[PDB]
Write a protein that binds this ligand. Structure first.
Ligand SMILES: Cc1cccc(NC(=S)NCCO)c1
Lengths: 300, 237
């Protein structure tokens, strides 16, 4: 069980850790989060009390180093930093643990939610989507645009998701125009899975990371990517059986975790209705269809 | 974007453009079977691809053999149309290729866009105009070449005959659409109007009769009266 200490909390802020959120008051004696489960990526995120504009946060894995948070009054945000002096870090955290200045990662023993949302997400793949090689952790915020969005403007600050475009030469073989547009199996299985992602685990990992960035930061380009990666599978007549079953589980837990009040902005009516009721896979996502119909029957 | 009455003069500027109408590609007659079920029998069709500035018509005849053993023919017809239009563009010299293709039915947008991916600089556009090009098969010489075809075939026409010698392309297109709207609303009466006078003939190399300027004024008025009369007979006004 690892720890992300805070130097201090000089500005009032809502702090999220995975699907949990809590409020810290201005200059409240707060020095971090302890008992963070080892074995998963995590995200620590922020929304300032005075300016709800810009949710921002950091993806990290405590197996890759000792990380802490410190407020920068010049740039006006909570920054993640790495501590290279391990004895110093341990001594700081111990002091703070003995003074009971740290909140506890509140995982229920029965609860597999975070595992289910991050099953295929790997820090090394996050760092290829979010390019900042001098750090072991990755910054994301509400406003970052994707590479695809930047084609239709700071490259260093982009989300480098795999570009999916159904009306592109990459997606459409010459001489198979109708076939490939109406059945995207070629594009899914040969171009994307065999060619670019190499396996379904990497595809699912990017899909899961896109969803989490949409949900936690309201990142619009991430929501577009999530829906595009769902639609590419549902619009393929030929999908490995284990992929369909896993996709059903992935989406079920995403829909389960989504805040009921954000469904208007985070769910695309056309994609979901096509996927659940028209596509080749309309009968392959039983768990997702049941939770969608009971939780969001208005969208459908 | 879309083509409407606000940007109508664009049709007659010097950017090459083509209208594509797919309404006569897939044509059937519906009939009873011996067991009392219903079946369709395809008949030959055509793609209507028209340059509205010059009157050049690229009439691609769709022979019924293209449907043999195929499913979902109304969907296939849109993709076959897009394939043939793309093939026509590739066959034209670069300086003759269109800068825009305007489809008369919005369901042609995605098929044509996908077939034209190699031509990113050719704009594929819909239109808000309700153009009467479905009535192309009411022109006797066009209907005749389609029905007689025994194999796929492209036939080239000028749908304006020699009118551009005397009028502008705006006026020629206006005359064309009036004639076709009349043929679409009441084919029998429209043909009676166009041929009632035995002394005015259709040249071997033309589609329409050889009316003088004054005779075209009379004809155009008669076509308007017909369209209006039918509008009354229809809605009882
Ligand atoms: C780490 C921390 C501290 C205080 C509150 C929270 N927020 C939530 S949703 N906890 C789960 C409530 O059962 C998280």
């Amino acid at each position: 069980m690892n720890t992300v200490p805070f130097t201090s909390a000089p500005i009032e802020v809502t702090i999220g850790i995975d699907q949990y959120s809590f409020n810290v008051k201005e200059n409240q004696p707060f020095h971090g989060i302890k008992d963070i489960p080892i074995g998963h990526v995590h995200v620590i995120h922020f929304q300032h009390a005075d300016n709800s504009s810009m949710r921002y946060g950091y993806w990290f894995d405590c197996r890759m180093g000792n990380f802490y948070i410190q407020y920068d009054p010049k740039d006006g945000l909570y920054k993640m930093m790495e501590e290279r002096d391990g004895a110093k870090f341990e001594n700081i955290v111990h002091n703070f643990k003995e003074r009971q200045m740290m909140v506890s990662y509140p995982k229920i023993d029965e609860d597999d939610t975070w595992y289910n949302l991050t099953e295929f997400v790997q820090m090394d793949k996050i760092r290829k989507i979010v390019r900042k090689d001098e750090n072991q952790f990755s910054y994301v915020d509400s406003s970052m645009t994707t590479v695809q969005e930047n084609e239709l403007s700071d490259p260093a600050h982009s989300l480098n998701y795999t570009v999916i475009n159904f009306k592109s030469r990459e997606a459409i073989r010459p001489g198979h125009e109708m076939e490939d547009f109406l059945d995207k199996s070629y594009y899914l299985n040969t171009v994307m899975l065999q060619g670019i992602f190499k396996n379904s685990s990497n595809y699912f990992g990017e899909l899961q990371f896109a969803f989490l960035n949409a949900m936690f930061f309201g990142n619009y380009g991430s929501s577009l990517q999530w829906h595009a990666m769902i639609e590419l599978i549902c619009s393929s007549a030929t999908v490995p059986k284990h992929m369909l079953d896993k996709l059903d589980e992935i989406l079920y837990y995403q829909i389960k975790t989504l805040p009921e009040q954000y469904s208007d902005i985070l769910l695309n009516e056309r994609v979901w209705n096509i996927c659940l009721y028209s596509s080749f896979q309309k009968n392959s996502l039983h768990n997702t269809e049941k939770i969608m119909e009971n939780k969001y029957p208005e969208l459908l | 974007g879309a083509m409407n009455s606000s940007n109508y003069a664009e049709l007659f500027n010097n950017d090459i453009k083509l209208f594509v109408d797919d309404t006569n590609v897939y044509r059937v007659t519906v009939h009873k079977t011996f067991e009392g079920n219903v079946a369709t029998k395809a008949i030959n069709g055509c793609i209507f691809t028209l340059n509205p500035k010059t009157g050049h018509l690229f009439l691609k005849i769709i022979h019924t053999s293209v449907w043999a053993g195929q499913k979902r023919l109304s969907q296939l017809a849109k993709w076959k149309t897009a394939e043939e239009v793309s093939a026509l563009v590739r066959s034209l010299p670069k300086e003759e290729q269109p800068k825009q293709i305007i489809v008369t039915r919005k369901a042609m947008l995605d098929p044509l866009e996908v077939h034209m991916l190699d031509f990113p600089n050719i704009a594929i556009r819909p239109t808000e105009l309700r153009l009467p090009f479905s009535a192309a098969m009411s022109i006797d010489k066009l209907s005749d070449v389609v029905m007689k075809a025994t194999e796929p075939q492209m036939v080239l026409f000028n749908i304006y005959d020699d009118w551009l010698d005397r009028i502008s392309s705006y006026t020629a297109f206006s005359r064309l659409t009036l004639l076709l709207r009349a043929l679409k609303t009441n084919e029998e009466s429209a043909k009676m109007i166009l041929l009632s006078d035995p002394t005015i003939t259709i040249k071997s190399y033309h589609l329409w009769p050889s009316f003088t300027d004054e005779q075209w004024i009379t004809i155009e008025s008669q076509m308007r009266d017909l369209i209006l009369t039918e509008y009354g007979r229809k809605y009882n006004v």
